Design a binder for these strands. Structure first.
Ligand SMILES: [Zn+2]
Ligand SMILES: [Zn+2]
Ligand SMILES: [Zn+2]
Length: 116
DNA sequence: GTGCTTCCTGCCAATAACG
DNA sequence: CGTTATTGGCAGGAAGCAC
């Protein structure tokens, strides 16, 4: 539940509770579950419950210890983008953020997500 | 001010629902 | 079963937090 804000040509969708704005309605619905708790996303490994599916997935990867992000310069693997990127910038003085091609994201094998 | 941890949201492929 | 709707993984910047 939202209202629309049209500014010179562009449409925005504004959340009725907290006023955040979204370029698409799908994002607003996804976000709104933080207010409504209509859907629940429980960790299958512990007691934590998450308002978004992606948050639970990232959390469950912490539990298994799977390292999907691999630096292609030296072979070292990392649990997420942030560690992969911080390693490449400090050790290799390169930005994985383009254009290059400096890391590999492996498929998730330690549990079953959608692939991709 | 450093660095770890978790969150956020546009984009769109994968999957599900629907009649 | 073909076709319209939903789900959620990804990048990479932002925010939150302990030191
Ligand atoms: Zn909101
Ligand atoms: Zn857990
Ligand atoms: Zn490296």
């Amino acid at each position: 539940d939202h209202y629309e804000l049209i500014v010179d040509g562009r449409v925005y969708y504004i959340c009725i509770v907290c006023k955040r704005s979204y370029v698409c309605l799908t994002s607003l619905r996804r976000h709104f579950n933080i207010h409504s708790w209509e859907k629940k996303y429980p960790c299958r490994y512990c007691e934590k419950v998450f308002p978004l599916a992606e948050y639970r997935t990232k959390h469950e990867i912490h539990h298994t210890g799977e390292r999907r992000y691999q630096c292609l310069a030296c072979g070292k693997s990392f649990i997420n983008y942030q560690f992969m990127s911080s390693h490449i910038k400090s050790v290799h003085s390169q930005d994985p953020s383009g254009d290059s091609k400096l890391y590999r994201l492996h498929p998730c094998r330690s549990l079953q997500i959608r692939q991709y």
